[PDB]
Amino acid sequence: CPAPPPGQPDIRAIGYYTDKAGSVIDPALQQQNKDATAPLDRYAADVARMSDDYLRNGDPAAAQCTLSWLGAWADDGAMLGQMIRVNNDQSFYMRQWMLDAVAMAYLKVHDQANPQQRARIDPWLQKLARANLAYWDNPKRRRNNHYYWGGLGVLATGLATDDDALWQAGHAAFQKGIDDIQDDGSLPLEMARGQRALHYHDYALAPLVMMAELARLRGQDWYASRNHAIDRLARRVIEGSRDPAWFNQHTGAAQLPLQASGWVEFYRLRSPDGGVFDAAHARGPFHSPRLGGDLTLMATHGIVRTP
């Protein structure tokens, strides 16, 4: 088990879109952001990977090393300080994505946590979750896909730490996202993203799918909400992956090509839909730390090894 890097209480991230539609990447701003957030993304990949190794192998050294890394950053009060604003709220967005990765990683190795590790990690995740919720109480921040990503970490913290209040807030974010699904399966706030509208429909669906998957650990069927409305979005996304024709004729910008993200590994098992997800499934792999790590592995073996 390698030594964890030091936990920084402050986040200093930088947005890299040039335009209003948040779709034209400034490659200078993107590199500046990637360097400034490199240790955060590096930590998220690591706890995702190690918690992957535990679910894959049963190996208790992978669980302990995950818990050791999480406890260290809890002790450091990592990300519990200043969210530095340069040009946008990219720092608040990183705090949502980082809670997502660390909470999901904590959930996957939680059965191996002793009461002393829990007493250190639980309050740290609960403070990040409350801070991520309180970010949205400002009525002038529009609740797009960021809100759905925010909800995933709050829900996983609510479930990991047995906090029913953070669990209900997680559901509230998921329900908001499901209620955004239009007749055509589009999301208005994601349709406004120009050449990345199709990207941001896949990007919005993934945390909704993972939140429905967490509710399934507790035996609830969130997929069924609003007469399976989520199926219209997942269905609209998988067809954009194949043929971007519908999206280009509704957006006023030629879509960049999209390979579906790893929500397909879970969703193909819940609503097979005659095998429309088969092509995406066969063209992985599907690793995203901010969604919990190895989505292929968690889809076939379970998000947790015991309830």
Resolution of the structure, angstroms? 2.4
Q: Is residue 198 part of a domain?
A: yes
Q: At what angle do helices 90-109 and 115-134 cross, to 10 degrees?
A: 150
Q: Is residue 183 part of a domain?
A: yes
Strands 293-294, 287-288: parallel, antiparallel or unpaired by DSSP?
antiparallel
Method by which this entry was solved:
X-ray
Q: Is residue 15 part of a domain?
A: no
Do 149 and 290 contact (CB within 8 A), yes or no?
yes
Q: Is residue 187 part of a domain?
A: yes
Q: Is residue 113 part of a domain?
A: yes
Q: At what angle do helices 145-160 and 90-109 cross, to 10 degrees?
A: 30
The CA distance from 3 to 118, in Å, is 20
The CA distance from 216 to 171, in Å, is 12
Mind giving me the DSSP string for 50-69?
A: HHHHHHHH--HHHHHHHHHH
Q: Is residue 268 part of a domain?
A: yes
At 293, phi and psi to the nearest 5?
A: 110, -120
Domain count within the chain: 1
Mind giving me the DSSP string for 171-219?
A: HHHHHHHHHT--TTS--HHHHTSGGGHHHHHHHHHHHHHHHHHHHHHTT
The neighbour count for residue 142, using CB atoms within 10 Å, is 10
With residue 77 as reference, give the H or E element that holds it.
none
Longest Cα–Cα distance in the chain? 56
At 17, phi and psi to the nearest 5?
A: -90, 135
Q: Is residue 48 part of a domain?
A: yes
Task: Give the residue numbers spanning the domain of 155.
Answer: 27-301
* Positive or negative torsion for Cα 187, 193, 194, 198: negative
DSSP helix/strand/coil, 229: coil
Do 96 and 132 contact (CB within 8 A), yes or no?
yes
Beta bridge partners of 303: none
Do 203 and 251 contact (CB within 8 A), yes or no?
no
CATH number for the domain harbouring residue 152? 1.50.10.100
The neighbour count for residue 186, using CB atoms within 10 Å, is 21
Q: Is residue 42 part of a domain?
A: yes
